[PDB]
Design a protein around this ligand. Structure first.
Ligand SMILES: O=c1ccn([C@@H]2O[C@H](COP(=O)(O)OP(=O)(O)O[C@H]3O[C@H](CO)[C@H](O)[C@H](O)[C@H]3O)[C@@H](O)[C@H]2O)c(=O)[nH]1
Length: 622
């Protein structure tokens, strides 16, 4: 068939390896991994032959692909004549999360069998220790293949002293997957969140780090369980600020407050704002309402649709991928309008936005919690959040503007089902428990908790995981992880179209929410299907939303657990107590608390920010 561009090819990769054309082999491997990255794990459009038995068996074909690719990478990286360049190593660190899955979704688990070929010390105390010859080539190959699922010992202080850039690059790579759930991967990331911030702080630029996964580092620390998990963000901001200044940046001087139609100007900088996205559903009504106090200028990408653009008085596209040009365009927009407020409803999904948060454009700079975590930025004054979603204020470096619980009325998805079907089983022989969670939300604590519920419950249970982001070569690994805790008592469903996803959940008798990072959309889905479930609460907003939303929707407090032991007890109770469970489901079906999420007075955000501006003006005399 005709296509836009030649597909990356396993055959061409293998051929280059055979010919010891190392440059062409590296190029083909990077092209394969980059295309997988583009398609979020899907391997369509990567060329390979396979036995005809696998034509209709997608999971088996994916494992075959991962196995074949693992074999080829083994042949290449074990070759002592293969010399990896520094720019080569940098490109591999950016896609290490995909390398991980090539091994982790194969039967091999990891690339440790390659690492073992690099050991030069026959007198080692442990097979888990790898001693390298003192050349940068073997150190880089070691580090590139030190994967999340590796069982090899690595002492970070040792690596740091040997080569800071390689050490830092590996630490980025190990933070960057969207599934860091296994004991081995979660343990590495855990250790990094404690050890790495004081080291990362020492970098002055991002030039020798894998820059393209910086925003993943920024976002992903929120899925760890440590109280101080967001510390790496403070460190990353310092590096970003330094990097920005070393590119010649100068902060805007605030000398005037511009007016348009007699109102001060709010510039809104958007990461995702298509009307099909959550952030539009959660945050658009309060922006529209703020036009009563401010003139709103929205800056977003080409992909924003008309409904998205229309929330603003005027809208401008960000032309291209260059971050300096974006900040320059934003700077000129704030200068031209003498902007009063800079608002970012989400920060973290784009590196450009993180740069923005580390510079001065307007006297009041504000985020909302599209990604629910503190910035640790010195340049962000305020966070907009619903009062009932806040746990501890100490989780944020910013000052929280705690709005009324109805101040951000949601807009319903247009894909919302209109003729929901209900299965209310009176006395099921097996209680089917649905878990709607992106892979980022899975971790050993959560899985161990489910295992305990299974082992202690006096009813039989089966866990159905509806796994957002478990796509293509991600899936076997995630499935094996689940199996390692729950055996035959769980089913791992790949990321699916919305209707399939709702079919999976609707056949469950109850749901359980992940922790520490809970759900929002998944709770909406739950009550849409007339289901009930248990959640865990805690101090972060991303821990506490579930509690607030359950209360908004009229679910009772016993379903909201403080400790892990509490969660276990409440989950068992909901599973065992068939009549109690069905009564709550009848409450939810009849009450339709969902409709109340779409109502509220949206004016507080505008009014609160206007009051803050007033106070700023009379403090500063501008
Ligand atoms: O197999 C699947 C899994 C999920 N979904 C859909 O995806 C929704 C869940 O959204 P995501 O997959 O993006 O997961 P989250 O709800 O955790 O994500 C949302 O909340 C985040 C903050 O935690 C960010 O704001 C993110 O961009 C936003 O989508 C579900 O309600 C459903 O509509 C499917 O259709 N099929």
């Amino acid at each position: 068939g005709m296509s836009r561009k030649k597909n990356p090819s396993v055959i061409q990769f293998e051929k280059a390896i055979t010919e010891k054309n190392y440059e062409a082999a590296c190029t083909e491997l990077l092209d394969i991994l980059n295309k997988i990255d583009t398609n979020f794990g899907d391997i369509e459009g990567i060329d390979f032959d396979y036995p005809q038995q696998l034509e209709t068996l997608m999971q088996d074909r994916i494992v075959y692909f991962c196995t074949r690719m693992s074999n080829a990478i083994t042949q290449l990286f074990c070759d002592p004549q293969f010399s990896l360049s520094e720019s080569g190593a940098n490109r591999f660190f950016v896609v290490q999360r995909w390398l991980n899955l090539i091994f982790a979704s194969s039967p091999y688990i990891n690339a440790d069998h390659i690492l073992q070929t690099y050991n030069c010390n026959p007198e080692r105390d442990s097979i888990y220790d790898i001693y390298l010859e003192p050349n940068k080539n073997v150190l880089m190959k070691f580090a590139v293949l030190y994967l999340p699922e590796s069982n090899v010992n690595l002492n970070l202080d040792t690596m740091w002293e040997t080569d800071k850039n390689i050490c830092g690059s590996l630490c980025f790579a190990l933070q960057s997957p969207r599934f860091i759930g296994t004991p081995a991967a979660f343990s590495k990331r855990s250790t990094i969140l404690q050890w790495f911030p004081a080291k990362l702080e020492q970098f002055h630029v991002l030039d020798d780090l894998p820059s393209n996964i910086s925003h993943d580092v920024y976002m992903h620390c929120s899925y760890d369980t440590a109280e101080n998990k967001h510390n790496v963000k403070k460190a990353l901001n310092q590096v970003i600020r330094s990097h920005l200044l070393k590119c010649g940046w100068q902060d805007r001087q605030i000398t005037q407050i511009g007016m348009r139609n007699g109102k001060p100007v709010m510039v809104v900088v958007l990461e995702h704002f298509h009307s099909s996205h959550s952030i539009y559903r959660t945050h658009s009504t309060s922006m529209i309402a703020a036009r009563e106090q401010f003139y709103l200028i929205g800056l977003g990408n080409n992909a924003v649709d008309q409904a998205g653009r229309d929330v603003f008085d005027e809208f401008h596209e960000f032309d291209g991928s260059n971050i300096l040009k974006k900040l320059a365009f934003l700077k000129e927009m704030c200068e031209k309008n003498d902007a009063a407020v800079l608002y970012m409803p989400s920060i973290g999904m784009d590196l450009a936005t993180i740069f923005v948060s580390n510079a001065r454009f307007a006297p009041i700079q504000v985020i909302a919690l599209g990604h629910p975590a503190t910035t640790h930025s010195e340049f962000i004054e305020y966070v907009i959040v619903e009062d009932d979603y806040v746990g501890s204020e100490s989780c944020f470096s910013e000052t929280l503007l705690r709005l009324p619980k109805d101040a951000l009325p949601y807009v319903p998805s247009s894909l919302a089902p209109t003729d929901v079907q209900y299965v209310l089983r009176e006395t099921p022989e097996v209680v089917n428990i649905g878990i709607a969670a992106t892979t980022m939300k899975l971790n050993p604590y959560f899985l161990e908790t489910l295992k305990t519920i299974r082992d202690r419950a006096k009813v039989k249970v089966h866990f159905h995981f509806a796994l957002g982001q478990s796509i293509g070569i991600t899936h076997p690994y995630v499935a094996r992880f689940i199996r390692s805790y729950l055996g035959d008592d769980a089913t791992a469903h790949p990321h699916s179209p919305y209707n399939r996803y709702l079919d999976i959940l609707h056949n469950c008798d109850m749901m359980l929410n992940p922790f520490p990072f809970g759900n929002t959309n998944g709770i909406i889905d739950m009550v849409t299907l007339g289901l009930v479930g248990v959640c865990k609460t805690g101090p972060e907003v991303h821990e506490h939303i579930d509690e607030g939303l359950f209360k908004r929707l009229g679910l009772p407090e016993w379903l909201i657990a403080d400790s892990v032991e509490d969660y276990i007890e409440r989950a068992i109770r909901l599973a065992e107590n068939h009549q109690e469970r069905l009564a709550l489901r009848r409450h939810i079906i009849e009450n339709n608390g969902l409709k109340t999420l779409f109502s509220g007075d949206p004016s507080p955000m505008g009014k609160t920010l206007f009051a803050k501006l007033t106070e700023w003006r009379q403090t500063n005399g501008i």
